[PDB]
TrEMBL record, chain A:
Family, similarity comment: Belongs to the bacterial ribosomal protein bL20 family.
InterPro entries referenced in this protein's UniProt entry, alphabetically: Ribosomal_bL20, RIBOSOMAL_L20_CS, Ribosomal_protein_bL20_C
Biological function: Binds directly to 23S ribosomal RNA and is necessary for the in vitro assembly process of the 50S ribosomal subunit. It is not involved in the protein synthesizing functions of that subunit.
SUPFAM superfamilies membership: Ribosomal protein L20 (SSF74731)
CDD domains named among the record's database cross-references: Ribosomal_L20 (cd07026)
Biological processes, Gene Ontology terms: ribosomal large subunit assembly; translation
Keyword Zinc in record: no
Pfam short name (any one): Ribosomal_L20
Protein name as it appears in the record: Large ribosomal subunit protein bL20
GO CC term (a single one): ribonucleoprotein complex
Keywords associated with the record: Ribonucleoprotein, Ribosomal protein, RNA-binding, rRNA-binding
Source domain of life: Bacteria
GO molecular function list: rRNA binding; structural constituent of ribosome
TrEMBL record, chain B:
MF terms (GO), sorted A to Z: mRNA binding; structural constituent of ribosome
Source taxon at top rank: Bacteria
Subunit details: Part of the 50S ribosomal subunit.
Similarity-based family: Belongs to the universal ribosomal protein uL13 family.
The protein's name: Large ribosomal subunit protein uL13
Any one Gene Ontology BP term: negative regulation of translation
Protein species of origin: Mycobacterium tuberculosis
One Gene Ontology cellular component annotation held by this UniProt entry: cytosolic large ribosomal subunit
Taxon lineage: Bacteria, Bacillati, Actinomycetota, Actinomycetes, Mycobacteriales
First and last residues shown, out of full length: 50 to 195 of 195
Function (record text): This protein is one of the early assembly proteins of the 50S ribosomal subunit, although it is not seen to bind rRNA by itself. It is important during the early stages of 50S assembly.
TrEMBL record, chain C:
UniProt source species: Mycobacterium tuberculosis
Name by which UniProt lists this protein: Large ribosomal subunit protein uL15
Known role: Binds to the 23S rRNA.
Gene name as annotated: rplO
Superkingdom, taxonomy of origin: Bacteria
Biased composition (Basic and acidic residues): 1-7
Automatic annotation (TrEMBL), chain F:
All copies of domain Large ribosomal subunit protein uL30-like ferredoxin-like fold, residue ranges: 3-53
Protein name: Large ribosomal subunit protein uL30
GO molecular function per UniProt: structural constituent of ribosome
NCBIfam families from the UniProt entry: rpmD_bact
GO CC term (a single one): cytosolic large ribosomal subunit
Ribonucleoprotein in keyword set: yes
Similarity annotation: Belongs to the universal ribosomal protein uL30 family.
Keyword tags: Ribonucleoprotein, Ribosomal protein
Biological process (GO), any one: translation
CDD domains: Ribosomal_L30
RNA sequence: GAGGAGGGUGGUGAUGGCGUGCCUUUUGAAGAAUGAGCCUGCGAGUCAGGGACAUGUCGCAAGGUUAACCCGUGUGGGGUA
RNA sequence: AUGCCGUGGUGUAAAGCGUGGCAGUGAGACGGCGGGGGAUAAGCUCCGUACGUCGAAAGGGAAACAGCCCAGAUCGCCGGC
RNA sequence: CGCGGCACAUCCACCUUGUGGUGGGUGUGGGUAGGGGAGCGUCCCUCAUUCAGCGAAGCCACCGGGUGACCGGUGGUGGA
């Protein structure tokens, strides 16, 4: 039974080239190039899911650091205070209350100050 | 999600740094942090918050004397040879603001936002800056804590 | 009926079509090299060049007697368990 | 269409009463003068083939 | 059946000498990668029925008939006729009243009265003979309408 | 009487003896503190894998 | 507003605010109580851990939606290795009433 | 429904960071190694043999089994070499 | 010193051995230590090493980076160490 | 590590105490050559049932779904 392998192939072809729209070049157009790019796009998106976990953490850290240094304390000592005080907030919500509430963040900074030991010995 | 960077959401203040006796590295780092806008918590690497920074008295900004005569500023012209070596000594008795501006631009990131940001830094040799139209508030440098 | 007919689960095994995409058995189908085996098949005789185990051992001693009087045996104990009574048997009765 | 038994290896191999193939331990044919008797009662008999020569020998026997 | 190379017409010429063209070394206009060229591993005129055993075949058959008798779907009959002139009127009547199902087997035998001559043209109703009785047909068929001669000689030959 | 052992380093560049020793101690992942009883062979193992484990004697 | 702690992550919600939280064991209707890390009244913030074990955020599980179709297609190189698998993270929607 | 506030998909995407195409072959390729300008159709592990081996499943049972052939028309019944 | 063989005890999940089906592989690279040939050379060549890694392993560090160090990715998270 | 969602292997308490399934505990889930297992989609023949000039296939577009191959819905085209 000679099969005429068109339909079977056009399935995945239309797959790739609908998940490939919006590509500058011969990539939304042609199929093999859309496939080369699909492999690269999905490794990029895979790497960027992890990468973005880490990157948002680094951004939040930059922000908490900026609000801390607005309160004359460094990010290191801020974290060591929010640890020793124990307020189990995390850098994400800590940065949110940093943005919207300078008041709540400065309460947090005074919390951290009140929970620093004495010195650079211990 | 953030709430900090959006349309017309960022604030534009001004700063005057008197580069009176300060050293070049601290000065440039301070101006760069003000210029990018990391002194701000409402920060993002995509947007341009940050303050217009003015650096005055940049004529007398401290460099090691043993560096005013050794550290050189090369700038190649594409043409063979054409490497235009130049120390910061003659470069200072010609354009100290160019020295300072060079250091600052070097401490910024390397992107297009770097350009949009550095268009905010003015630097002048004498004490007299012309951008007094605003209320340029003096920001002086202060190591913090820890 | 026929709309209620299935083999025993255990038979009717999936054929392995090999050169069908690098997800099942992909390119080389099992001969995964550029060697000799990757295009053809080396026999069971050829051993590299050193005399194979069927050339260095000696032909087995002795001949085959053309007139080998081959019989067929029947077990006297199993001729008991063939005939419990018995009394009368004979080659035709065995066959 | 009808499989050939490899002749030369059926004239040298012997399927016993069960699944054993017995080769002939016979570097014992040409020069038996220096060879001590020990090394001939070492080379007089029919040795069950080892594992590392079986899977092929049987396909020579078929 | 399809023409593998060596059956394809022509193509015993190597066009395009090996080197110096810029093309691919081809070897025959009938290479399977060409058009019109041969088929590879193609369908050839196979003749494939499996050689099953006598016991398996007969046992399958009598299992299917066992099913039919287990439901009460076997309908042994004397003759499926009006008696001598093959008429499908009364024969359809007596089958679609004898069966009430859709598919019917009718094991008449090598006698034509109105059996294997008159109940044809009835869809669902296939006619067999007491010895070419088989598995696929008793299964395909819902009712298994016999003819007492067919049934009795069938029993008598199977014992 | 007791030891509370914890892998603190992986076992990639760890030679065979060290890796089988972390099997036979019972250490799967990194922050994975197992407890080891009476110390005659257990201290032998806790010598064979010193860079990989940490011992703070549990009660 | 309180920094509810749920699913190994933490969220910042005041009363009446929807949250895409993890697959809490629940149905629609029946409420559910979630711990906090830090609850705030503007200038009265709560920080002391034993003062927070009392404060319980509570909200009505509803919706039990799914996440979005996260298409994985691992593909190394000349290695010749593809592994395509997707993922709908099961979620739930939440309201906050504390 | 207007200028719209909250909101949702869909174009596009200023801007930031991350990031060295596919294949074959290689100790090693993004490779300045091979091959491909692109799209659509065609192109590669098949089948024959009461074959050899091993195994999964199924008949019957110290048995199993028929080959050619004879009767029949569904591949059914005989056929004991 | 090590390593090797045995036994004795404790621990450990498939690890072992026997017998089959199916393979592949038999161009290895660098790195640590031990040595040969080199010249007290090589990104050299050839060996040893229950040594490692790449091969065939991604992520972090090394500016960039097959072999170096941390670490072995089942998927998701705008969470922590 | 936390929290969710798949998968595999051994193990018990089980249902029918080996087939196959409930609960759990533990371990595990990079991968090339290669090995095993399970599967998607194309087309042809049978049995069962079913949709179709009120609109079949094919095609195109959108909206959905499956862990993957891929699947369904809807509209446009078409006219078996």
């Amino acid at each position: 039974a000679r099969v005429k392998r068109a339909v079977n192939a056009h399935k995945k072809r239309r797959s790739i080239l609908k998940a490939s729209r919006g590509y500058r070049g011969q990539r939304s157009r042609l199929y093999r190039k859309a496939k080369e790019q699909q492999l690269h796009s999905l490794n990029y998106a895979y790497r960027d899911r992890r990468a973005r976990k880490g990157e948002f953490r680094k951004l939040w850290i930059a922000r908490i650091n900026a609000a801390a240094r607005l309160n004359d304390i460094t990010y290191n000592r801020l974290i060591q205070g929010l640890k020793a005080a124990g307020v189990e907030v995390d850098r994400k919500n800590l940065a949110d209350i940093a943005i919207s509430d300078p008041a709540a963040f400065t309460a947090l900074v005074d919390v951290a100050r009140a929970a620093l030991p004495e010195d650079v010995n211990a | 999600p953030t709430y900090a960077p959006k349309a017309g959401d960022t604030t534009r203040s001004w700063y005057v740094i008197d580069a009176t006796d300060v050293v070049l590295g601290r000065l440039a780092v301070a101006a760069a942090n003000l210029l990018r806008g990391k002194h701000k918590p409402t920060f993002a690497p995509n947007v341009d918050g940050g303050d217009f920074v003015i650096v005055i008295n940049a004529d007398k900004v401290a460099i090691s004397g043993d560096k005013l005569q050794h550290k050189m500023v090369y700038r190649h012209s594409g043409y063979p040879g054409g490497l235009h070596k130049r120390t910061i000594g003659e470069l200072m008795q010609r354009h100290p603001d160019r020295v300072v501006e060079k250091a600052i631009l070097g401490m910024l990131p390397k992107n297009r936002l770097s350009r949009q940001i550095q268009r905010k830094l003015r630097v002048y040799a004498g004490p007299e800056h012309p951008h007094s139209a605003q209320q340029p508030v003096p920001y002086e440098l202060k190591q913090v804590a820890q | 009926k026929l709309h209620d007919l299935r083999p025993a689960r255990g038979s009717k095994i999936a054929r392995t079509r090999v050169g069908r995409g690098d997800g099942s058995k992909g390119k080389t189908a099992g001969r995964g090299t550029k060697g000799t085996r990757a295009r053809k098949q080396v026999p069971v005789t050829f051993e590299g060049g050193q005399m194979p185990i069927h050339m260095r051992l000696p032909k087995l001693k002795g001949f085959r007697n053309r007139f080998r009087t081959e019989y067929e045996i029947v077990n006297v104990g199993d001729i008991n368990r063939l005939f419990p009574q018995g009394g009368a048997v004979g080659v035709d009765d065995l066959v | 269409p009808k499989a050939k038994t490899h002749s030369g290896a059926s004239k040298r191999f012997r399927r016993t009463g069960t699944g054993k193939i017995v080769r002939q331990k016979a570097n014992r044919r040409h020069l038996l003068e220096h060879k001590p008797s020990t090394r001939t009662r070492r080379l007089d008999g029919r040795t069950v083939v080892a594992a590392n020569d079986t899977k092929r020998v049987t396909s020579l026997l078929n | 059946s399809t023409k593998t190379r060596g059956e394809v017409s022509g193509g015993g010429r190597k066009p395009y000498r090996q080197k110096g063209t810029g093309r691919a070394r081809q070897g025959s206009t009938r290479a399977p990668q060409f058009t019109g060229g041969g088929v590879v591993h193609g369908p050839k005129p196979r003749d494939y029925s499996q050689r099953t055993p006598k016991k398996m075949i007969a046992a399958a058959l009598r299992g299917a008939l066992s099913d039919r008798a287990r439901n009460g779907r076997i309908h042994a009959i004397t003759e499926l006729v009006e008696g001598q002139n093959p008429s499908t009127k009364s024969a359809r009547a007596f089958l679609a009243s004898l069966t009430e199902r859709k598919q019917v087997l009718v094991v008449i035998g090598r006698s034509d009265e109105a059996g294997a001559k008159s109940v044809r043209n009835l869809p669902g109703v296939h006619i067999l003979a007491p010895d070419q009785l088989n598995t696929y047909d008793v299964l395909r068929a819902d009712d298994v309408v016999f003819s007492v001669e067919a049934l009795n000689a069938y029993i008598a030959a199977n014992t | 009487s007791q030891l509370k052992i914890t892998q603190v380093r992986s076992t990639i560049g760890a030679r065979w003896k060290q890796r089988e020793s972390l099997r036979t101690l019972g250490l799967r992942r990194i922050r994975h503190s197992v407890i080891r009883e009476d110390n005659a062979a257990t201290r032998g193992l806790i010598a064979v894998v010193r860079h990989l484990v940490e011992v703070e004697p549990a009660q | 507003y309180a920094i509810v702690k749920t699913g190994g992550k933490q969220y910042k919600v005041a009363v009446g605010d929807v949250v895409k939280v993890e697959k809490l064991e629940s149905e629609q209707g029946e409420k559910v109580s979630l711990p906090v890390a830090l609850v705030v009244d503007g200038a009265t913030v709560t920080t002391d851990a034993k003062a927070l074990a009392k404060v319980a955020v509570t909200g009505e599980v509803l919706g039990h939606t799914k996440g979005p179709k996260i298409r994985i297609h691992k593909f190394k190189n000349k290695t010749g290795y593809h592994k395509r698998q997707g993922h709908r993270q099961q979620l739930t929607v939440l309201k906050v009433t504390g």
